């Protein structure tokens, strides 16, 4: 199929700061990826983002009823919906399952990589650190980064490049809002 | 309780 496509998008955004104490509503219209007109509650009228949106900004701004619907939205839409969903979204906490296991930089070698797998957590903000004999190791650390699973959980793998020696105790430490103290997992060669 | 929708507005023809 080589027929040309044309796409319209709309994003009605509610931005929350300190719960519902400070709230900003941003109503956005797009042609393909180009935002062409928006209402920003900071402004209280529509503004054209590109020339394409000038006719809509000018007309919608002439319609007092449309403007007042837009102006109330921070309250009747944003603050309202925050109220409706906050208990299972804002307050959602899922603690991670932490596993540590050795790996190889090349399938033929011995083990020269330690993996700290952190799975299934929510929300996304997390701090994962490696320790060797109680001292934090900051060199040779690499990660997948934060990975969304698409099902309201995240995961991340944090690797330590090291050749383990007998006697050494490695510790992966995880800090996350679902945790009241750091979660630590030990691994020994 | 009910999630409220934000109406999308007809542009100028």
């Amino acid at each position: 199929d080589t027929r040309p496509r044309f796409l319209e998008q709309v994003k009605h955004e509610c931005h929350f700061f300190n719960g519902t104490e400070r709230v900003r509503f941003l109503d956005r219209y797009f042609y393909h990826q180009e935002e062409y007109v928006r209402f920003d509650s900071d402004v209280g009228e529509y503004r054209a983002v590109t020339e394409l949106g000038r006719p809509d900004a000018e007309y919608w701004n002439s319609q007092k009823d449309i403007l007042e619907d837009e102006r109330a939205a921070v309250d009747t839409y944003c603050r309202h919906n925050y109220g409706v969903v906050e208990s299972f979204t804002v307050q959602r906490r899922v603690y991670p399952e932490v596993t540590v296991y050795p790996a190889k930089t090349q399938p033929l070698q011995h083990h020269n990589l330690l993996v700290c797998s952190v799975n299934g957590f929510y929300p996304g903000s997390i701090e994962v650190r490696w320790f060797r004999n109680g001292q934090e190791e900051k060199t040779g650390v690499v990660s997948t980064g934060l990975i969304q699973n698409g099902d309201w959980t995240f995961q991340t793998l944090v690797m330590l490049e090291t050749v383990p020696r007998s006697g050494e105790v490695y510790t992966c430490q995880v800090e996350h809002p679902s945790l009241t103290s750091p979660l630590t997992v030990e691994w020994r060669a | 309780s009910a999630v409220r929708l934000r109406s999308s507005v007809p542009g100028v023809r």
């Binding site: 044309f6 796409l7 998008q9 393909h32 990826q33 698409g150 309201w152 | 929708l5 934000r6 999308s8």
Partner: protein, 179 residues
Amino acid sequence: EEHVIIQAEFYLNPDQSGEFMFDFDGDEIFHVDMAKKETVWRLEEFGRFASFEAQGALANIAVDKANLEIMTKRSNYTPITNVPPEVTVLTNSPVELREPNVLICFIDKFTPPVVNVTWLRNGKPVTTGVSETVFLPREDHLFRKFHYLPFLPSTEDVYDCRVEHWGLDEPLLKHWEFD
């Protein structure tokens, strides 16, 4: 900034596809099945706490379709440029032999919101147990999407997520196997 909630909509011509969903901090709260006119909660439990009248989505999508007509003309019929996806295959959790797990095919940074996605096991399409999300909005106004395949990990099977998109010259296959 603590949190963002977005009611995201699109309408695509000539496909006549429209979508309506709510996003919280990058995760889908729910979408509306336009054909069935039903609210589909991303997690089962969400719907015990909240409701959404699906009919309102249909009304919005109708406005979006009319607006697309208008904007298409304003643009002098300038079509969208295809942006092919990045595709990653990973598992839900660390893989162990014969321990139930889930393959995730993550399809990211693409537009228009149209793809054909197939799971292949040993080079053969598989459909039992599969599931997928709708098209999820990105802050750069492209799209992302997830497909899922529960599986029992063995050394016998290899897997591929095959993704077709108009921005690709040929289907993109991303491989996964044990070890």
